[PDB]
Amino acid sequence: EFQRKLYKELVKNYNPLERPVANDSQPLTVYFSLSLLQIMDVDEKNQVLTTNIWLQMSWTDHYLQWNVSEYPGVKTVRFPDGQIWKPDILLYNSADERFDATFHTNVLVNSSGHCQYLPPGIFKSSCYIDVRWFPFDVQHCKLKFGSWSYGGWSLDLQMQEADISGYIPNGEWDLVGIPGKRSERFYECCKEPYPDVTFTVTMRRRTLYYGLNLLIPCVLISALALLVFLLPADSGEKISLGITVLLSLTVFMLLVAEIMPATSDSVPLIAQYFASTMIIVGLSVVVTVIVLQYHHHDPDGGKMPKWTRVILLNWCAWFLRMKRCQDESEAVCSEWKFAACVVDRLCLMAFSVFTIICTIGILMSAPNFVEAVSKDF
Amino acid sequence: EFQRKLYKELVKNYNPLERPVANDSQPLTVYFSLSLLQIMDVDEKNQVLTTNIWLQMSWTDHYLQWNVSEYPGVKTVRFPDGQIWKPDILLYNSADERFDATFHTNVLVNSSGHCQYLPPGIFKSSCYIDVRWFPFDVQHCKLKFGSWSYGGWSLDLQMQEADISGYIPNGEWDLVGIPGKRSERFYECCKEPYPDVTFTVTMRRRTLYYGLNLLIPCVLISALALLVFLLPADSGEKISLGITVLLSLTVFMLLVAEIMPATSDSVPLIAQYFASTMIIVGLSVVVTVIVLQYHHHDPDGGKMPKWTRVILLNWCAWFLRCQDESEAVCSEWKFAACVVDRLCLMAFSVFTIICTIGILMSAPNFVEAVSKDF
Amino acid sequence: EFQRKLYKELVKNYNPLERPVANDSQPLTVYFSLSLLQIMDVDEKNQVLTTNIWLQMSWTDHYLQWNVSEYPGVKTVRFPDGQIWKPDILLYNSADERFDATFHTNVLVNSSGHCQYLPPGIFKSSCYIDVRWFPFDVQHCKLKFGSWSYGGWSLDLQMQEADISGYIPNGEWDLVGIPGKRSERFYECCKEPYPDVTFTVTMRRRTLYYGLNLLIPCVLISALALLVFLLPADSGEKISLGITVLLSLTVFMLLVAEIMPATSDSVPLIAQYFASTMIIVGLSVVVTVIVLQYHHHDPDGGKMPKWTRVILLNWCAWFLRMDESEAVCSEWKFAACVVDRLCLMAFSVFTIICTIGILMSAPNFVEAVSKDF
Amino acid sequence: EFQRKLYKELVKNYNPLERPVANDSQPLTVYFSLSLLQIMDVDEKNQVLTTNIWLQMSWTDHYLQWNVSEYPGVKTVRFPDGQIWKPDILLYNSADERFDATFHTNVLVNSSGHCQYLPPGIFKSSCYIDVRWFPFDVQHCKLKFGSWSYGGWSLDLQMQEADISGYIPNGEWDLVGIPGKRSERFYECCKEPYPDVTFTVTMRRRTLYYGLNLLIPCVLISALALLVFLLPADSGEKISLGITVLLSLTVFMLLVAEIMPATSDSVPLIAQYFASTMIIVGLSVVVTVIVLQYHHHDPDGGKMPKWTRVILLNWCAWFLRMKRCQDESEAVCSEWKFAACVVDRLCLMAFSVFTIICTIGILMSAPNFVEAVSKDF
Amino acid sequence: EFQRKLYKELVKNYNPLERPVANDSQPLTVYFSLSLLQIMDVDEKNQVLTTNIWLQMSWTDHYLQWNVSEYPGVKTVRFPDGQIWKPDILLYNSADERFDATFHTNVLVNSSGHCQYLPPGIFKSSCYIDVRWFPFDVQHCKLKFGSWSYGGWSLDLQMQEADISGYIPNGEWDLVGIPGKRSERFYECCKEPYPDVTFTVTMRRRTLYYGLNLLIPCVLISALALLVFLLPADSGEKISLGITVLLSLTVFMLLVAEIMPATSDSVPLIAQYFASTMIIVGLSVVVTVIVLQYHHHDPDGGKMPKWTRVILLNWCAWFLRMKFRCQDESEAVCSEWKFAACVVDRLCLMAFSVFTIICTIGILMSAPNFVEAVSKDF
Ligand SMILES: *[C@@H]1O[C@H](CO)[C@@H](O[C@@H]2O[C@H](CO)[C@@H](O)[C@H](O)[C@H]2NC(C)=O)[C@H](O)[C@H]1NC(C)=O
Ligand SMILES: COc1cc(OC)c(NC(=O)Nc2cc(C)on2)cc1Cl
Ligand SMILES: COc1cc(OC)c(NC(=O)Nc2cc(C)on2)cc1Cl
Ligand SMILES: COc1cc(OC)c(NC(=O)Nc2cc(C)on2)cc1Cl
Ligand SMILES: COc1cc(OC)c(NC(=O)Nc2cc(C)on2)cc1Cl
Ligand SMILES: *[C@@H]1O[C@H](CO)[C@@H](O)[C@H](O)[C@H]1NC(C)=O
Ligand SMILES: *[C@@H]1O[C@H](CO)[C@@H](O)[C@H](O)[C@H]1NC(C)=O
Ligand SMILES: *[C@@H]1O[C@H](CO)[C@@H](O)[C@H](O)[C@H]1NC(C)=O
Ligand SMILES: *[C@@H]1O[C@H](CO)[C@@H](O)[C@H](O)[C@H]1NC(C)=O
Ligand SMILES: [Ca+2]
After folding, report:
1. One MF term in GO for this entry (chain C)?
2. Angle of helix B216-226 relative to helix B269-295, nearest 10 degrees?
3. Ligand nearest to the CA of B268
4. Cis ω on the peptide bond leading into residue C135 (within 30° of 0)?
């Protein structure tokens, strides 16, 4: 009875094209915020951020005011899209094909004229994804909201702190915070200034997932490659092991490619580690060729270098604590074999040490390594 | 004749914005339920659940009442979207790009003003998937339905038990149940409390596909890896087999990885078992390299250590001219390589059987999964 | 001229929300059928069927009638969605994200009030796919159509048979038929019974494509694996061959898993075939490890058992019409060769026997080889 | 001033549902054509053709006529969707999820009443793709256009020759033409005939892309397989080479399989060529096994067969101009090695002949192959 | 209060179908431009360009004018889609399924009647991604905008320079510029010429990514192939390493064919380079078989020719500074064959290395944009 009358009376002469201000010269103050419900996807390959966001817009409509005493029990009213004025706040740095992922819901208006509009939306936003420190990366993704057509002279956008109470954790990204900033920017379209509210979601990738799927396995497979230098040369599988492991390590980097944006702004940390790892094992094959070349050096062929004869069978042999014509061929060849064995032991120490130092050096360079090991392991 | 008059009479002064109550201070009782016709997909990667559902919403419109005696033969009427008041009951935890996958069908009203609205939909809901027990995992996915802008003071949402009569089994997911719970939450936006209807779909994965397509094949590939310790050393291909099988076992992790999300909440059981299997194969390859070093040992190198000469050639063995004399030392080494192979075959077999069983029987749902599915 | 008059007359006091019957008690007979223009996809992984369908709905509208003598030359009118009552006939089992893939077109009414409505559509239906016999399957995919909000007491659905005159061949599926049936079923929601029409599209998979790209190719790589037995053991690559071919067979299995649903209601015939190929090639690897063990036997190890002696190197050799340390090893190398032969014949009969049975156990096999080869 | 008058005057009593004719008994003549702007994609796997088209629909509205003298400077008017009658000319064999991909634009009407409607669209269209001669294939994709609900008695559809002046090439297909055909067809629904206009886009594939990516790499890697025969037997890597080559020659069959539909009407030419190649390579593996059986033959085994002694060591040995107890063993085994060696060289030439013959024959079985090599190479 | 009055007065008799000119015979001047906010994607495979674009259309509506003195504080009004006349400027060469990705926003009209309309949009345009010089490639994508139904007689389209003010860098594409051009062309449909504004965004590819993912790895794994010529023959592993490397060189080229279109207009630089290295490594495999023929050469086989005995063991040997009785003769003869095998290994190492150096460097510098690419990205 009374609610029918109110709906009939609130829409008499009401024009949804009119900014609902009593004085036209004063700007309308609209309080903007958002509730970040979930970070569903951070598409690093496309540099996109898909998030479930409930925007919160509250303002004061001068025309939708009534006595609750004269309309008993009617304390709130609801209006749909297109029957009431609404602020045309839009996400400037959108990546969504329709550019407006917001789902239009009712606006709730109470008797003092205060209108409240909370449209849910799967907002897809264009974010610069800094992949320098991946996986140990902290992203600062900006969500920039502002009126598309109303400037500061008309629509006085005002911040309110973002809600995280209803946030459901992701599992891959650990929300560090969502600080917001209100600025009054000038654009080359227009002379009227435009205010905006930018929320910088600061997300810390939890590293257990890719710590284990990508980095730990690479290290153990690179260790499998180091076994090459203990394999006896006469086995015949010295290099097979080296080349087969190498293709296993390539499938790890093809998988990084599946997610890495096509940018050239910087070299991701993991790429540096895999690049250094691959070259180290690639160099393992090279020294493998040389030790085999030494192992098989024709007996009758040109005698051994004196330098070699000291640098491997006198000094390096002692450091590591190792110690008829056909017979001399076997004796000369056996010395070639002994040099080969010493080079095998030498390069194991050196490539193992180079692997260890390289591994920690590249990994420990990340300012998030200490943090990530502390929280995520 | 009468149907035309009824339709013309029911839309006089009707306001689809008005809540169709007689007393404005009392709320409107809306009975909510759903019929889960199917569970179409469970995208563990995007953490989404695609289900075919018919929402059921039944209430009373005070204004769409007619006395049937005067309208003979017109027992019901039908109204489309935007001509009748409807409760804006949305899925809060929606993961659909439009956020409302519901299809707006008609509202059927009988003469007592009772309205019935059953929109079909393919709902995408944002589910936390607990992947710790994968594949022997049970999921509790919530579908939380509520009026977006009507609090309890206006719309008294009341749950009715879910229907599964027409449910079409999925083949991967055995509907364990769809227990529901109502509630009256409070939001930071607003002071008026808001009620909601949460159905916690309880789904048990059916473990035959993933049992036979990944877990069992992985066991047999690890067995092919174990085969190394039965190969004669002189064959010249111990390492070839060992490494071609270690790299092959990665395949399974690629498929496991393209199905499972990238959360760091926990380590999936499938991941633990595959990691243990690959680590066992890697330790087999390492043992293989020590065996090859023993086998291809230069006779004029070091003398055989006493510890080695008893721990391998005497105890384990019992439990289970210069060229000539050089041949015999190298012979001893070949025997020691054989003893290490046999000892390590036994030990690696025991760990594989233990590890896989120990890991698989760690799942609370393993016994039920095996008995019901295999 | 007469069009303007008829179109103005036919819409006076017309309410599209009014089922168009003269008497409100009797039901409205709506004839439903469909034209199946193509089977675009059978997404087996998703258990969905995507089809080109022209639904065919005919009924009679009491109010939309006239005298052609008073509107000469005006023998039909057409109305767009929104201005004429229409049966809300939906596909209940619809997998499309929208739930109504129908494209809304005009309703054509002739002067006796008979309205004809043929909306085209790309219909995705949630179909259960019976994969036990894949690739020799006969999918019975159901398209269940009916009014969403009119019961039998109000809308008397009736079904004419489906059209296939314009049906285009698919190349993967032979339309075995599209029979239909009317079913007046009761729902737990409501007491008024609701009629539905179900068209059971019966599709026979043309097995030449898959047979050529999955089954036949596998047989030959399994034979390639069997060639291990007859390699001389001195070559040095017996297990190399075995392991390579067995990995390739895994390539095949990954493909067939890319195309087979994730269902525990049965095991596809194809899966059982690859599982048994790789099982046999696995046991080829095992017996070849035993063979190498025999070949690389230490002459100073154990003496040959009389069982190993007469079983393998007397009787088994006999049938197949085939210095001391070298002699002892020579006896051992001959053991490897007889195991090589014996295993061939034995594994070969398995190879041939198994497949033929796994394959010929499908009821559709004879038809498949006769029609698709 | 006058444009407002004319727009206000052309909407008096107008009904967008009326067929705009003076006499209700004579059919309206609609001239239909299309401008094919680009063939954006040919989804062979889905049997779909995605094309950029500007359909051209021209007719005469009896009611939208004025004299430009009374409305000076107003020679044309424009009406958007839902305000003017437009023919419901759809694409019968459409594959788009929404069926009508046309983007609805304005209808331009001049003073004499002639209306012109050129809506752009991305028309997905079910095309039977004959893959028998792929990559050397010519496709005839039909776009069948017609009025959905007007028969020949109401809408007399008429053909205007298609436009390809503004066609920009595709890069994968060479437009042979787009000849049309107007038919008057009867349907099982109804008695009234329906005229339709069918354009048969004829496309010739440009084969250099697949020519260099799928074809020549197969010939090359196959020659690399044939190198197996020239290795000496003692290397101990013949079998590994053959299998490595074959399992990697399977790469191209899983790759081409990524694009072709699952049709069983016929067998693709590329598939026939790959199958022949694989049969030849597998037979090379088989003969490699036989050659190793010859080479690693125990001397004390069976005696050399007489037929073997002659067919290899006497006739073939001359066709290719080839030529104590322990001592006899290598002599017998040396005959076996020459037997193995003559077989290797013989079969090298024989398998080589099969490769060139099979490749040339199979490739030359495509009728337009001569045109292909003359235009794309 | 006054804004209600103005909105009620501006729509009295207004018709959104009418072009808002006072003189019907004079074309309406529409100033068109755009702001390029991001190059969201360049899909070379599908031949598409996805861009974040804010179009700018400005014109003068004769009917939406008022003096602000009579409407104090109301200096600007805003009309949504379907309430005000708007220019139907579409993107001709669009590849979007709906053909028009523009998001319809309000039109802002100030007190002098000047209307300004800035619809944002994720525009998908059908581009000719020339790919002969990939990865050192410069792409010219044209975005042609123009009224779909109005010619130069009714709507005088006028270009305004484009902007890159808020161009958010992409990381893969260095925007070289967005020069525009206004043309007046005739079409086979009509007798009225239709003006258009074509913006030709020129984008240079930053080659660091695909340079170290494809160009460089190939060089290093091809070096691994070259290692075959250093392997001793006695190891009996030359063929394994050679073939395994040459099979692992196709994985990259499969990703190379996963990004670039299947066009047959030109052969990409990357494809030429990959073919050249693949031919060189395959020739390494062929030579590996030949040297193995030399190495495992039966001593009782064919006698050494006097050409191979001088062309390898005398001249080419001298260049590189290499330096029971029946069995001894047999082993000595085989050792000459083994020596011949070694000389061919060393020669082919040098020859294939030089052919790799030349081929790699020459082909890579054949791109016009190579010096600039290496100078900016390294
Ligand atoms: C409405 O807006 C237009 C454009 O913003 C204004 O016209 C411009 O005014 C500036 C200021 O002097 C001039 O420099 C430009 O040359 C003008 N351009 C055009 C196309 O007119 C116009 O003045 C504004 N109206 C009012 C009442 O301020
Ligand atoms: C390609 O090769 C691999 C790929 C992998 O995934 C992408 C993994 N993944 C893995 O080890 N994941 C684990 C381990 C544990 C415990 O939990 N998750 C391993 C290899 Cl070798
Ligand atoms: C890589 O290696 C494999 C991969 C596989 O798929 C991913 C399977 N799959 C399999 O065995 N699937 C079955 C068996 C039966 C019966 O039913 N489905 C096997 C291997 Cl070896
Ligand atoms: C992985 O390995 C293969 C994969 C294949 O496709 C999926 C095929 N396909 C094939 O042989 N297709 C043919 C043959 C003929 C004649 O026609 N189509 C073969 C192998 Cl080996
Ligand atoms: C298939 O084989 C590879 C594939 C690759 O990616 C596609 C890479 N990629 C790579 O090296 N990327 C780097 C290196 C550094 C430093 O930074 N990014 C390497 C190989 Cl071997
Ligand atoms: C409906 O109409 C009949 C006929 O006049 C009347 O007797 C009956 O009381 C009416 N129903 C109600 C609830 O008043
Ligand atoms: C319709 O009108 C005509 C005259 O216009 C009349 O002859 C005819 O009888 C009417 N209806 C019938 C019964 O066909
Ligand atoms: C238009 O006006 C001219 C001049 O008054 C007249 O000659 C001509 O016939 C008119 N055309 C029409 C609408 O018949
Ligand atoms: C607008 O009003 C002012 C004062 O009310 C008047 O002086 C002016 O002339 C008016 N505008 C025009 C264009 O005349
Ligand atoms: Ca890219």
Report:
1. transmembrane signaling receptor activity
2. 10
3. 2
4. yes
* Distance (Å, whole) CA C117 – CA C122: 16
E strand or H helix at B345, and its extent? Answer: helix B322-360
The CA dihedral of D121, D127, D130, D134, to the nearest 10 degrees, is 30
- Per CB-CB distance under 8 Å, the chain B contacts of A7 are 15, 17-18
Distances in whole angstroms, Cα of residue A286 to Cα of each of A179, A271, C10, D203:
53, 22, 90, 52
Alpha carbons D294 and D336: distance in angstroms, whole number: 6
DSSP annotation of D186 reads -
Compute how many other C-beta atoms are within 10 angstroms of the C-beta atom of residue E88. 16
For A157-183, b where at least 16 C-beta lie within 10 A, e where not — what string? bebeebbeebbeebbbbbbeebebeee
- Contact yes or no for C183/C194 (Cβ under 8 A): no
List beta partners, residue C199.
C143, C180
* Beta carbons of D145 and D89 less than 8 angstroms apart: yes
The token duo for A122 is 């799967």
Of residues D262, D264, D282, nearest to C372 (C-beta): D264
- Domains of chain C and CATH, by start: 2-206 (2.70.170.10), 209-372 (no CATH)
Ligand in closest contact with the CA of C132: 3
DSSP of A251-274 = HHHHHHHTTS-S--S---HHHHHH
Q: For residues B365 and B174, is the Cβ–Cβ distance under 8 A?
A: no
Q: Residue D180 corresponds to which amino acid?
A: G
Contact list in D for residue E243 (CB cut-off 8 A) is: 224, 241, 244-245
Q: Are E92 and D118 in contact (CB under 8 A)?
A: no
What whole-number distance in Å separates Cα of residue E57 and Cα of residue A332? 88
**Contact check, Cβ <8 Å, C189/B118:** yes
For residue C217, the surrounding DSSP H or E stretch is: helix C216-226
The whole-angstrom separation of Cα C25 and Cα C30 is 16
Among A9, A45, A213, most B C-beta atoms within 10 A, so best to mutate, is: A213
Is the bond preceding E135 in cis, omega lying within 30 degrees of 0?
yes
Q: How far is residue A249 from each of residues A217, A229, B34, measured CA to CA in Å? A: 9, 18, 50
Structure tokens at B12: 């006089």
State the virtual CA torsion across E31, E35, E39, E43 in degrees, nearest 10: -10
Q: Return d(Cα B49, Cα B41) in angstroms, integer.
A: 6
Per DSSP, the residues of E53-100 read: EEEEEEEE-SSS---GGGSTT--EEEE-TTTS----EEETTB--TTS-
Q: How far is CA D358 from CA C21, D215, D355, D372, E169, in A?
A: 72, 13, 5, 19, 53
* Nearest residue to E101 via CA among E41, E164, E53: E53
Q: Which residue among C120, C231, C236 sits closest to D289, beta carbon to beta carbon?
A: C231
Q: How far apart are CA A178 and CA D335, in angstroms?
A: 84
Q: Coil, helix or strand for B359?
A: helix
d(CA E345, CA D93): 64
Question: How far does the CA of residue A12 sit from the closest CA of chain B (Å)?
Answer: 14
**Residue entry with tokens 């993107």:** E91
Q: What is the DSSP string of E146-211?
A: EESS--TTTEEEEE---B-TT----SSEEEEE--EEEEEE--TT-SS-EEEEEEEEEEEE-THHHI
In a mutational test of the E interface, the residue from A98, A189, A300 whose CB has the highest number of chain E CBs within 10 Å is: A189
3-state SS string over A37-65? EEEEEEECCCCEEEEEEEEEEEEECCCCC
D204 close to D189: Cβ distance less than 8 angstroms: no
When CB atoms are compared, the residue of D4, D108, D121 closest to E18 is: D4
Distance CA B46, CA A374 (A): 27
DSSP class per residue in D123-134: EEEE-----TTT
